[PDB]
Amino acid sequence: ADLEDNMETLNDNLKVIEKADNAAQVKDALTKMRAAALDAQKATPPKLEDKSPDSPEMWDFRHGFDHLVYHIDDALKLANEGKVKEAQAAAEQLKCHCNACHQKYR
Ligand code: HEC
Ligand SMILES: [Fe+3]
């Protein structure tokens, strides 16, 4: 999918997690977020269109998604342990990282 669609997937599923009734629901949402993060990582954002694909900016952009995936994986651990509230709180730790990338590259 294109970058905009993957961002909608991230945004929608964070809301799903916030509204979830059990940890399996959180797990399913996080799983979709993981996949959308890795698909987004393949994209070139508009603001870097005129930069080298090997530029430090593009590596930073890509690495931002690695870190999002790292957080998703830690929250998945909690979700798979049935810890719905902890897993929800861990998913909220994503938000600053959404914001930081947006500040740089949106
Ligand atoms: C870079 C490492 C990013 C991270 C991490 C996250 N987002 Fe993002 N997002 C990024 C860019 C470069 C853009 C602009 C793309 C463009 O074509 O203009 C966006 C945009 C969004 C949007 C808006 C989509 C739209 O059609 O305008 C949303 C709703 C969004 N991003 C959500 C989102 C969330 C919830 C994230 C953390 C879970 C997140 N993004 C991380 C780059 C990056
Ligand atoms: Fe972090």
Swiss-Prot record:
Q: Where in the cell is it found?
A: Periplasm
Q: Which domain of life is it from?
A: Bacteria
How cofactor binds (record note)? Binds 1 heme b (iron(II)-protoporphyrin IX) group per molecule.
GO terms under biological process: electron transport chain
Its cofactor is: heme b
- On whether Zinc-finger is a keyword of this UniProt record, the answer is no
Q: Which UniProt keywords apply?
A: Electron transport, Heme, Iron, Metal-binding, Periplasm, Signal, Transport
Complex formation: Monomer.
**Full protein name:** Soluble cytochrome b562
Natural source organism:
Escherichia coli
User: Which gene is this protein's source?
Assistant: cybC
